[PDB]
Design a protein around this motif. Structure first.
Motif, PDB file in Angstrom:
ATOM      1  N   UNK B  57       4.695  -2.424  -8.664  1.00  0.00           N
ATOM      2  CA  UNK B  57       3.464  -2.217  -8.222  1.00  0.00           C
ATOM      3  C   UNK B  57       4.071  -1.756  -6.602  1.00  0.00           C
ATOM      4  N   UNK B  60       6.712   3.114  -2.340  1.00  0.00           N
ATOM      5  CA  UNK B  60       6.744   4.849  -1.016  1.00  0.00           C
ATOM      6  C   UNK B  60       5.606   5.550  -1.801  1.00  0.00           C
ATOM      7  N   UNK B  61       4.432   5.633  -0.534  1.00  0.00           N
ATOM      8  CA  UNK B  61       3.383   6.019  -0.342  1.00  0.00           C
ATOM      9  C   UNK B  61       3.159   7.570   0.429  1.00  0.00           C
ATOM     10  N   UNK B  62       3.589   7.216   1.623  1.00  0.00           N
ATOM     11  CA  UNK B  62       4.046   7.713   2.653  1.00  0.00           C
ATOM     12  C   UNK B  62       5.955   7.655   2.678  1.00  0.00           C
ATOM     13  N   UNK B  66       9.375   6.150   3.059  1.00  0.00           N
ATOM     14  CA  UNK B  66      10.879   6.986   1.925  1.00  0.00           C
ATOM     15  C   UNK B  66      11.933   6.612   2.833  1.00  0.00           C
ATOM     16  N   UNK B 196       9.149  11.486  -9.802  1.00  0.00           N
ATOM     17  CA  UNK B 196       9.281  12.937 -11.167  1.00  0.00           C
ATOM     18  C   UNK B 196       7.320  13.156 -11.704  1.00  0.00           C
ATOM     19  N   UNK B 197       6.570  12.393 -10.188  1.00  0.00           N
ATOM     20  CA  UNK B 197       5.566  12.675 -11.283  1.00  0.00           C
ATOM     21  C   UNK B 197       5.065  13.884  -9.962  1.00  0.00           C
ATOM     22  N   UNK B 198       5.362  13.785  -8.574  1.00  0.00           N
ATOM     23  CA  UNK B 198       4.690  14.385  -7.577  1.00  0.00           C
ATOM     24  C   UNK B 198       3.320  14.422  -6.803  1.00  0.00           C
ATOM     25  N   UNK B 199       2.656  12.656  -7.982  1.00  0.00           N
ATOM     26  CA  UNK B 199       1.387  12.116  -7.349  1.00  0.00           C
ATOM     27  C   UNK B 199       1.186  11.258  -5.803  1.00  0.00           C
ATOM     28  N   UNK B 200       2.423  11.600  -4.611  1.00  0.00           N
ATOM     29  CA  UNK B 200       2.575  10.691  -3.930  1.00  0.00           C
ATOM     30  C   UNK B 200       2.900   9.087  -3.971  1.00  0.00           C
ATOM     31  N   UNK B 201       3.212   8.645  -5.094  1.00  0.00           N
ATOM     32  CA  UNK B 201       3.156   7.592  -5.292  1.00  0.00           C
ATOM     33  C   UNK B 201       4.943   7.245  -5.573  1.00  0.00           C
ATOM     34  N   UNK B 202       5.757   6.784  -5.082  1.00  0.00           N
ATOM     35  CA  UNK B 202       7.292   7.078  -5.496  1.00  0.00           C
ATOM     36  C   UNK B 202       8.267   6.024  -5.584  1.00  0.00           C
TER      37      UNK B 202
END
Lengths: 457, 457, 457, 457
Positions: B57, B60-62, B66, B196-202
Motif C-alpha cells: 500500500x 507515490x501518487x503526485x 516522487x 510500469x502501469x502509468x496509472x498514477x500509482x507508483x
C-alpha cells in the motif's frame, strides 16, 4: 471396420472453452488492475486526507470538512497536469451533467422548497432533486489575456448529496506487451458526498467507469494481433455448433427408444404406466453438457459484441463463460465414469444425493429460523447480524469456524448493554454451532457413510 | 551366531540429517532476522513517511511526492553516518550501476524517443530502457577545500521507473555468541519507484541482497569453531553413501528374484504372471530411502559450497535438506511397521489411497471448474479472486472456513455494483462450500471408514 | 444396616477446589486488569510517540529518535505528578541500579574497549557490559534555594542497550469493593532500548513488575475480611488430606490383591498368568484422584505462602490449581460411569485410545517431517514459519483452516522472489493440508467409528 | 364427505409470523443504521482526536488530555449548529442532571472527604459520589446585550469520572420513503471519562439513547400508512389464538387417552400397565407449537406497546419474536415428517440425540475443566483467556480453528516471560484441540454414524 469414438471430441471443449476463458480472463484481469490502481490514484489525488484502507469509514462529519473536501477535490482537478503523475487529460465534455464546453461539474442535489426545525414545527417539504451544478474547465497553457465555484453554498439542512462529475482520457501504457502503438482509455469519476441519512455522517466515495477505444494512429502491424483472439472464438462457435448438433441426435434416439420400449409389441403391462425411472429415460447428462454449450455460445457472441462494438459491460457474458467452463469441467467426471472402478465412487454420490438433499431441506429450514431470530435480536447491537444476507453469511461462515471469536468478542462489548441480549447471544451462537457441527455435519457424513456401505452389497 | 540388524543404521539419519538441518537452520534463521531488521531499518531511513505495515500500500501518487521521496532517500544516504544508528559504511563502488568512484546511484529508466497525448494523436514511441544515472558519494570527514543530483528532471509522461542503487558494508555484532572477532556483511539496497502501469500509482519498495565474507583479523581461536559444523556434513556424506550403497544391493536381490520367481523351474504358466507384482516385488521403501538420500547428499554438497566459497544463494539446497528431512521422517513410519499391530493401522491407508486418489481426481476436476468460473466473474470486482493462484488459494482455504466472512463481506460491498454478480457470488460460494464440506469431505471420510471396515474382515 | 457411600465425598472437591480456583482467579484477574492498564498508561506517558497496538513494531531507527525517546521518557518521569493522572509517587530508591538517594536511573550497557570499521579492520573488542548509569530524583515542592543527564552520549557503534529503571508506588483504588482503607502497590518500570542486533532497529519496550503490601492505617474492620479467604484453603487442606488418606487405603487393597491372585491356593495355573493384565486390572482412578490431590495441596500451600508472606510468585502454583481443577473435572466422568448406559459411550474411547494413540504417533512423525521441512525453506521468506515452535503452531492451526489464506497471501508476495520457493510452498501447504484433512482426520474418525461398531457386538 | 386438514393452517404462521418479524425487522434495522451513524458523528464531533476504530483503545492518560477533551467536547456542543452537519438542535432541558433552564451539563463524580499518599499514610476516605455539575446552554442568535465552565478543576487524585450529559432533538429525514412529513427523534448523549481503576488510563466513551415521537404537523395522508402495519399484528393475534385454542383440544384427547389406554377394561395385565411409558407417551409437537405461540403473542402485545405506547426498550419482545420465528421454523420439520421417507432421516436424530446428549455431558465436563484451568494460568499473561466467558468463547471458537494462530502468536510474545507458562500453554492448547477434534468430534460422528446404521435394521 469399427471406427473410433468420433463423438468424443467433447475433450476439445475442455481445452478450447477453458482457453477462451483464460485468454479473455488474463486480458480482462490486466485491464482491471489498471482500472483500480487509477481509482486508488484518484482517491489519493481528489479526496482530502484519504488513507489506504478507509473507504466505508472515510467520510465527512463537520461542514468545514465538506467544503474543504469539495474545494480540495476541485483544486486537484484544476491542477491535475501540474501535480498528478501518470499523464491524464481533461475530457472537454459534451454530456448530460456538463454544459456545452465544460469539464468538472460539482453538482448539489438538494430539496426544492422546505424547512426543518425541532420543537417549533412549521414546514412544507416537497421531495425533489433540484440539482444546481457549477461548471469549470481550465486550459493547458498559462492564463492568456482574454467564477463563483468557490463562492458556493451547500444548504446542509436541505442537502441530499454533492456529486463531482468528471472524465479523464488516458493512454494505457501496458500496451508495449503487444509491442506497437497503444489502446486508448477514458475514466469517468464520481466523487459522491452522500447524505441520504441526515445523521451528520457523509460517506465520501470516489468511483469510476471505464470506456475504451482505439485512437488515431497510421503505423503498421498492430491490426493483425487482434484478429488471432477474434478468430479463436470461431473455433468455439465451430465446436459449440457440433456439440449442440450432437446431443439432439442422441435425444432423437431417446424419442425412438421411448417408442421401442413398448413398441416391439405393445401392452407390455396393459396401458399408461408412468415409468418414473423412464422419467429419467434419456441419458440427460449430455443434454446438460450441451445446455452448458448454449451458455458458452451465448457467452461468446456477447463477448464478441463487447470486443467488436462500443458495448461496454462485463457482467452477464463473464458469468456465462465461467458457468459454462465450470459446468463443462464438472462434466469431465461423467466422461471419467466410462472407467468401471471410478463409477462406483461416483455412484455413491448419485445414490446418496437424494437422501442428502432430502435431509438438507430440514437443515436449511432450521438455519433459516436461526437467520431470522439472530437478525432482529442481534441486528441492533452487533455489526455482523445487520441484514439477513450478512446474518446468513456470518452464520454460514460461522459453521466452519470463521470469525467466531470475532463475533463472540462483539458480544462481550454489548454485555454491559442488555445482559439478556449477551446471554441470549451466548446461548444462541452455542446452540447454532453445536447443532450444526456435531449433529448436522455428523449426519451428512452418516448418510454418505451409509451410502458407501449400502452401494457395494 | 545370528548378528543383529546392522542394516538398520537408518536410525542414524533420523538424528544426523535432522541435526544437519537444525544446525544449518538455526544459523540461517539467525542471519535472516538480522537481514530483515536491517531492511526494516532502511525503510525507516530511506523512505519518506514510511509506516510499519504499508509495503504494498506504500506508494507515490503526485509528482512532488516522487521528488521528495527520492531526495529524502538520497539525503538519508548522504547523512547515514550522521543520523542512522547501527553503524554502517558506504560501499565505494566498482560495479555496473556505479561509476569508477561512486556510491549512491539514482537511476531513471525512461523511453528513448516518444510522446503521449489523448485527443490529438501524433507520436512515435520506440520502446527502450534509456537509463540516466546520477552518481554521488560523500566523504567521512567535514568538507575539505578541494553536482546536479538535485537539479534533476524525471519526465513523468516518459518515466518507466526510478531505481536508487547502493550497498552498505556492515559488521554483524551477533558474532559474540561465537565469542571472538565477527563475520562481515554487505547489504545491497534497491529503492524502486515502479511505474510500469502509468496509472498514477507508483509503488515505492526498498529491497536488499546480502553478501557475507570474513574481513581482516590476526587474532586466535575463531578458525577452529567453523570446522566442527563443516566436519558434521562429512558424517552426512558418510551415512548417505552407506544408505545409497545399502539400497542398491537390496535392488540387486530384486533383479535376482525376477529370475528366481520363474527360475527354479520355468514355465509355471508360460510367462503369465502379471509383472505388476514385479512393480510391487522390489521394496519401494528403499526407493523412498534413496529419494531421501540423493536430496540429502545433493543438499550437503551445495551447503558445503555456500559455506566454503563465495556462493551466496539459499533456495535449492534449502529445499533439498527440508524435502530430505521430511522424506526421511515420513520413512520412520515404514520403520515403525515392523510392529504387527501398527501395520494394520497403516495398511488401511495403503488399501484406501488408490480409491481416495481415484475420487480426489474427480474433486480436483470440479474444483478447477470453480477456480476458472470464480476467477473471471470475481476477478474484476473482488481482491481475493484476482488470479488463478489466489482463487485456488482463497477457495482451498475457504473449504476449511478461513476468511469466509471476509470474502462474503467483500461481496456486500459490491452489491450496489451489479447485483447479478453479488447474487451470483452468493450462489457460487454457497454451492462451492456446501458441496465441498457435506458431500466431498464426507465421502473422503466414507472411503477410509469403509477401508477400515473392509481391511479387518 | 447398609450405610451409604461416605467415600463419595469427592463431590465436595468439585465445588471446593473450583471455588478455591474462582475466588483466587477473580481476585487475581482483577489485579492484572489494574496491573496492565498501568503499563498501558506508562507507554502513553514514557514512550515518545507510542500508539495503541505497536509494541513489537514500536522501535527507534535514527539517533535523534533514541535521544528524544530517552529524554522524553526522563522528562515524563520528572513531571509525573505534574502531567500524569492516576496519582503516583516516586520510589526514593535504595536498590541495585539506583544510588543511596536516587529514583530514575537511565543506564547504558556498552562495550568496554573496542572498535568497528568495515574495509579497514583494526580492532580489539573485549565483550563486556560496562554499565554507566545517570541518577535523577526531583522533589515534590517548587525548587528551593539550596546535572549532566541531558549532557549524555550514547556511543551507538558501542551500544548494547539503554535501560531506564524506576519504580512507582501507588494506591489501588479498586479497594472500595472491600469497603475500607486500600491495599498498597508498587510498579517497577523498565524502558529497554534493545540493540543486541546492531541492525539499525532498536525495539523500545516498557515493562513492569508489581510488588504489593499493606501500608499504615489505624482504622477498623478491614482485617476480618482477609481471614475468610484464608480460612477457605483450610477446607481444601481438610478435603485433600481426606482424599489422599482415602486413595492409599484403596491402594492397600491393591497391594493385597497383588498377593491374593495366587494366594487362595498357590499354583493356580502354573505360571500361565502373565501378570501384565493384573497391572491393567487395578484401577488408576484413585491415582488420577491423587494426582489432582497433590497438585491441589501443593497449590494451596504455595498460595498460602504468597498470601501469608513474601508474596511474589504465581506461575507454578497458578498452574497447579488449574491442572488440579481440570484433573478433578475430567474425574467427574469416571464418577459419571457408575451409570450403565453412559459407560458404553466412554468405553468406546477406552477401547479405541490405544489404536488412536498408536496411529497418532505416525501422524506426529510425518507432521514433524513437515515442521522441519517448512522451517528451513519458509523461515527466510515468510514470517509464519520462522522458528519450529511457530511452524508447528502455524501448521497445527492451519490443519483446521486458521490463517490459511493469510499464509497463502504471504506466498504470493514472495512469488517474484524465487518462484521455486513459491511453487514449493504451494505444493508444500497443499500436500500438508490435503493429507491432514482428508486422510488423517478421516482415519481418526474411522478408528473411533470402527471402535463404536466393534464395542457393541 | 371427508373434509381436508383444516387443522393444518399452521402453514399460515410460517408466513404471517415471519412477515411480522421481517416487517418489524426491516423498519427496526433502518432505525439503528440512523441511530449508530449519529453516534459515529458525535464521536467525530465531541471527542478530541477520535479515530474510526479505536473505541476501547480510545482513552486519556495525561491531565491536559482530559481537560482538552472535556473543553473540546463542550466547545463542540456550544458550536453544534455552527460547525456540525446533519442539522440538530439543543434539548433545552428539564430533567435530572440538568437545571430548570440548562442543556449541556459536564458533571464530576468525585470523593467527598479523603486523601491519597504512599509512604506517608494519613487519610480518611469516606466512599461517596459527590457530583458537581456545571450547566451551559447557548442561544441560536448572535449574543444580545442582556460562566466558570472553563474555570474548572477536576481533582484527579479524588476523581471517579466526568460525565457530559446532553440530548439532541433531530428529524430523521429517511421519512420520505413514507412520502409525507417525518417522524421525530431525540438522542441522549453521555460522554464518560471513566476512571474507576485509578490506573492512569481513562476510557473516553460517547454513548446515546434514542427517544422517538411524532411532532406537530397539520398535513394529510400520513396517518393511514401506520395503521396497515398496526393491523397486521391482529392477524398474528388471530392466528395465535386459533393455534393456542387448537393445541389444548389435542391435549384434552391426550388426557382422555391416559384414561382410555387402561380404560376400555382396567387391569390389562394384573397391575401392569406399568405407566412409565404413559409418562413418556404424550406428544410434544403441539407443546412446541404452543411454546412458539405464547412467545409470538407475548411478542406482539409488547411490540404493539413498544411502537404505539410509551415507546421504551427493544430487548424482550425482540427476543420473543425471534425465538418464536425460530421455534416455528424448526417446527416446519415435524410438519415435514408426515412424509414417509423424510421421517427416517429425522428419526436418526431422535434415536441418537439421547446418546449424543449423554456423551455431550462428558465433553462439557472436560471442557469446563479446561475453561477453569486456562482461565487462571492464561488470564494474567494473555488477552484471550481473561474471563471465563472469554475463555469459553476463545476455546469453543478454537475447537473449529478460529484465531488459533492468533492465540499461539500471543503465547510466543510471553515466551521470554515465564517459559513454564509458554510451554504450559503449548501443551494446554494442543491437548485441548487434539482431544476435541480427533477424539470428541470423531465420537460425535460415530454415535450418529452408528445410529444411522442401527435405525434401518
Amino acid at each position: 471396420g469399427r471406427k473410433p469414438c468420433k463423438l468424443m471430441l467433447q475433450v476439445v471443449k475442455i481445452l478450447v472453452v477453458t482457453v477462451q476463458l483464460i485468454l479473455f480472463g488474463l486480458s480482462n484481469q490486466l485491464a482491471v488492475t489498471f482500472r483500480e490502481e487509477n481509482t486508488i490514484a484518484f482517491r489519493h489525488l481528489f479526496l482530502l486526507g484519504y488513507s489506504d484502507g478507509a473507504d466505508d469509514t472515510f467520510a465527512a462529519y463537520t461542514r468545514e470538512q465538506l467544503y474543504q473536501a469539495i474545494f480540495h477535490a476541485v483544486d486537484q482537478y484544476l491542477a491535475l497536469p501540474d501535480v498528478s503523475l501518470g499523464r491524464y487529460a481533461y475530457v472537454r465534455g459534451g454530456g448530460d451533467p456538463w454544459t456545452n464546453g465544460s469539464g468538472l461539474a460539482l453538482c448539489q442535489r438538494y430539496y426544492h422548497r422546505g424547512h426543518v426545525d425541532p420543537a417549533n414545527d412549521t414546514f412544507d417539504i416537497d421531495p425533489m432533486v433540484v440539482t444546481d451544478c457549477i461548471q469549470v474547465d481550465p486550459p493547458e497553457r498559462p492564463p492568456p489575456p482574454p467564477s463563483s465555484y468557490k463562492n458556493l453554498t451547500l444548504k446542509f439542512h436541505k442537502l441530499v448529496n454533492v456529486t463531482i462529475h468528471f472524465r479523464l482520457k488516458t493512454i494505457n501504457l501496458q500496451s508495449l506487451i503487444n509491442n506497437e502503438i497503444p489502446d486508448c482509455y477514458t475514466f469517468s469519476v464520481l466523487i459522491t458526498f452522500d447524505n441520504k441519512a441526515h445523521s451528520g455522517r457523509i460517506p465520501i466515495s470516489l468511483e469510476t467507469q471505464a470506456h475504451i477505444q482505439e485512437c488515431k494512429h497510421p503505423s503498421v502491424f498492430q491490426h493483425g494481433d487482434n484478429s488471432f483472439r477474434l478468430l479463436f472464438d470461431v473455433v468455439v462457435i465451430l465446436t459449440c455448433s457440433l456439440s449442440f448438433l450432437l446431443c439432439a441426435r442422441s435425444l432423437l434416439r431417446g424419442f425412438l427408444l421411448q417408442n421401442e420400449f413398448v413398441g416391439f409389441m405393445w401392452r407390455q403391462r396393459g396401458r399408461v404406466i408412468s415409468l418414473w425411472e423412464r422419467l429419467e429415460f434419456v441419458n440427460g447428462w449430455y443434454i446438460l453438457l450441451v445446455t452448458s454449450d448454449v451458455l458458452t455460445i451465448s457467452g461468446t457472441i456477447m463477448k464478441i459484441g463487447i470486443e467488436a462494438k462500443n458495448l461496454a459491460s462485463y457482467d452477464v457474458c463473464s458469468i456465462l463463460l465461467g458457468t459454462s467452463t465450470l459446468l463443462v469441467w464438472v462434466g469431465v467426471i461423467r466422461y471419467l465414469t466410462f472407467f468401471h472402478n471410478y463409477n462406483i465412487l461416483i455412484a455413491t454420490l448419485r445414490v446418496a444425493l437424494p437422501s442428502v438433499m432430502r435431509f438438507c431441506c430440514c437443515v436449511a429450514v432450521i438455519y433459516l429460523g436461526y437467520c431470522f431470530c439472530g437478525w432482529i435480536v442481534l441486528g441492533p447491537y452487533h455489526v455482523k447480524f445487520r441484514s439477513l444476507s450478512m446474518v446468513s453469511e456470518c452464520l454460514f461462515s460461522l459453521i466452519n469456524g470463521d470469525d467466531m471469536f470475532v463475533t463472540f468478542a462483539a458480544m462481550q462489548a454489548q454485555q454491559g448493554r442488555s445482559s439478556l441480549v449477551w446471554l441470549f447471544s451466548q446461548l444462541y451462537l452455542y446452540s447454532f454451532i453445536s447443532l450444526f457441527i456435531y449433529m448436522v455435519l455428523s449426519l451428512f457424513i452418516a448418510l454418505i457413510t451409509g451410502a458407501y456401505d449400502t452401494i457395494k452389497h
